[PDB]
């Protein structure tokens, strides 16, 4: 709020960064075009429109298949010194294998926002995998749910090879994967997600999975193939200056009360929000407190997985955007976990014992502000973690926008709630950095209002506001006015 | 240890307790007079002689039954403030319950004892049981493994009320229980106790058990007789300035290495080892870790049962001896629970990365000088657990001394180890007092040298040298001599 509060670019190390992000299936439209393949996404939309909020789908999304050399433009205006976006999956290879051929459509699309970035002066920071499967690969062996653990694991090693291949020469900094955590719990937990699978009893469109196991194993196939792609870079494509690492989904944790058992509740809820998919990469073998109570339902690695997965990563990415109370479930007959997440034997709570909530309510049912959270996961990550280079790979909210309260163009550029969230989380990053984080970037999440998965076209997280009413002309809000100021001045 | 460093009884409170203590089994002997009915250790001792290490018993002990005026006179010499000693079950109740009848003799010896330690100014701090099961009970139904967990129960309580009903006038100070851990893992783990049970392929009298249990049933028992023990005290007998508890035995932990996952084995051996006996009378059940670990082996708590159980003490006893580095240990295919205490899946180990011990040794095979562990327990019993009023129940050192290496009468009164050994945990306890600690008192384990359960009469505990050559004549050890010179001065 106060004008000596507002972030000021000089704030930062001069080789700071800050840009945008998106991803593939949110914004590229185009999903049947150039010998693109289907994907999870384009099959569970069509089929089943019915578990999409508004029914939507992103056949088109922001249009940006057609129309990088705009996003391009904006971000230059905007003076960010980076982009991250990722790559279609079955756009590159339309059977998701290699015998099934590189569309050369595809690889030519990517090459050409690359140059075009570098040409603005734009690092590109290009992340493998967002989610988009190839419908494929899911058909012929569940995708990520691969009981082998070898297909799913080629198969997506081959994929990174062919993205080294072609733009390797490019591209400084790579992303295997982005949220690992929410993929897994929400395809196959919660299954409100592609391809919607779910324990049966549970609300979902194929209640004849295990939410109890599947997002264990989709999660380890996730591991195998992070470490296996990265044993091809270092091996085959790295380069002095070059980086590579994955990004993870986590909301702060809070103890609910004064007693020890929230704060071991809080230990539990961390373990399985960032440790289940950070631990094995930094020494190799998820959490203690994973094993000891997922046991079997969470597969052991062998001693050359735990090798190739420990210190797989030059970087690390933190998607941040709430965090939640985390109050205490004791072990006892009165009590089966239902969900994976339910492993943690903890609720997690918006309103603390005060009533109050955590943080001020964003719009969106979800996001709640609480910039404190960040700065404790950046101190975890500094103290326990071995204080890697860290990049906030996302971070924003979403202005709800529905065709029974529809959000005025007007309203949606002024997007104040969506500047202020931006500027205080900056901040947080300031202070994080002199006590010794060793933070060095910030993206803000969603260059471009698009698909938000079952959520549909019902939020707006753009810094940028695009029209679908008129050619999905870009429009920047007061938020992506500042991001320029601040960038420049 | 500087002069300047040496304690002096004004460092501490006026109202702080200084005292000696010693346990039935190990000092009374008459094992078979004035109708005192057989005990597990008298079976034990007298059946497999070839599972103590001299093949001793303790028929005589330091033959205390008969002795104890002498007893009383070492402590009024000394300025002791109080006495900690237990009462033997199976001489008060020959057959271990009502229907065997009280037994004359065994009323009359504590009501002497206790009344003559009260004429001296001596305040007695009265444990109810220590190890010495009636025999009868054991071939009843296995004492402790009682696996209705009732008759065992009833038994003790009825025992407990006996002493309330006899004693309840004169004592202010009751402990139901003394090393709960110790007596189930050593007695049903490893077995090296009576009755010497251990899971078959072990090496122990009886390897027809289940070392991973066995413990945890003995141990259950344990805390629903003293829930009822305490209910039964707190409804008929406590008076305004009386109090009642137990205590346990503890080692203290320091993680092996600087990696996080050391810190979390060190948490986990804190909870093993303490927090097993612990958590269930301050909370009503038992460490989140080791249900989580031994899983269906750790007996569940009925409503009425944690209710009864939480907060079931006025003050709380600590036996303090050594510490531990504690080194992690990954659940994996390739590692297996042996016995109960290898549930915390962490080593407990002498010496740390540098192959230097913790502490110095100080002569038997398993106490290494580290007074900071003490430190660390009273700072985790002040922050962590209520901070309660404590009460080092139990603090020592034993000189080796054995057929092969005797130790001679004069160096064994020289025992300047101890000495010093007993002034640094004293000079702890006062920097603990200054931080905050509940502390009230500390009580010198073993007035008396005396048996020594599986180790015999190889090992000399005592401030108070015994010579058994002679009449079991009591002579005062350096140690003894400090004391008494800091009680008065």
Redesign the interface.
């Known amino acids: 709020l106060s004008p000596s509060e507002i972030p000021q670019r000089d704030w930062f190390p001069s080789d700071f960064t800050f840009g945008a992000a998106t991803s593939a299936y949110q914004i590229e439209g185009a999903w049947n075009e150039d010998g693109k393949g289907e994907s999870n996404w384009d099959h569970f939309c069509h089929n089943h429109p019915e578990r999409i909020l508004d029914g939507s789908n992103s056949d088109i999304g922001a249009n940006s298949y057609h129309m990088y050399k705009t996003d391009v433009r904006l971000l230059k205006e905007m003076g960010m010194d980076a982009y991250r976006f990722s790559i279609s999956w079955p756009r590159i290879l339309p059977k998701g294998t290699k015998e099934g051929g590189i569309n050369p459509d595809g690889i030519k699309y990517y090459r050409n926002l690359i140059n075009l970035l570098l040409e603005n002066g734009i690092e590109p920071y290009v992340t493998i995998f967002h989610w988009d499967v190839p419908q494929a690969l899911e058909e012929k062996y569940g995708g990520f749910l691969d009981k082998s653990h070898k297909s799913i694991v080629e198969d997506y090693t081959y994929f990174a090879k062919v993205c080294f291949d072609n733009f390797g020469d490019k591209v400084k900094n790579w992303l295997t994967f982005n949220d690992p955590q929410t993929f897994t719990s929400f395809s196959y937990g919660t299954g409100v997600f592609a391809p919607g699978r779910c324990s049966p009893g549970l609300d979902c469109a194929y209640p004849t999975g295990n939410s109890l196991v599947e997002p264990y194993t989709a999660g380890h196939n996730i591991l195998l193939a992070h470490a296996e792609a990265v044993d091809l870079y270092n091996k085959h494509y790295k380069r002095d200056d070059t980086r590579i690492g994955l990004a993870f989904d986590v909301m702060g944790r809070v103890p609910y009360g004064t007693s ?2 929230d704060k ?1 509740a809080e230990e539990r809820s961390w373990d399985i929000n960032l440790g289940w998919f950070l631990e094995p990469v930094v ?1 190799g ?1 998820y959490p ?2 994973m ?3 997922a046991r079997e339902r969470l597969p ?1 690695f062998k001693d050359e997985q735990k090798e190739k997965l420990a210190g797989s990563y030059n970087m690390l990415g933190l998607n941040y955007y709430t965090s939640r109370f985390s109050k ?1 479930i ?4 009165n009590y089966s976990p239902v969900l994976n997440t339910d492993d943690a ?1 903890a609720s997690q709570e918006v309103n603390g014992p005060d009533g109050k909530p955590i943080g001020p309510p964003m719009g969106n049912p979800w996001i709640y502000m609480y910039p404190e959270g960040l700065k404790d996961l950046l101190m975890i990550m500094k103290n ?1 973690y071995g204080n890697p280079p860290i990049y906030i790979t996302e971070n924003g909210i979403g202005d709800v926008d529905t065709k029974e309260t529809p959000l005025p163009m007007e309203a949606a550029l002024n997007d104040y709630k969506r500047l202020d969230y931006i500027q205080r989380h900056i901040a947080t990053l300031k202070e994080s950095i002199d006590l010794g984080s060793n933070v060095q970037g910030y993206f803000a999440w969603s260059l471009l209002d698009n698909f938000e998965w079952f959520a549909g076209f019902t939020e707006r997280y753009g810094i940028v506001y695009v029209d679908r009413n008129n050619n999905c002309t870009r429009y920047m809000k007061e938020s992506a006015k500042w991001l320029k100021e601040f960038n420049t001045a």
């Open positions: 020890f058992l071991q020494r073998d203690f407190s094993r000891s109570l052991f205490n004791d072990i006892s007959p034997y326990k």
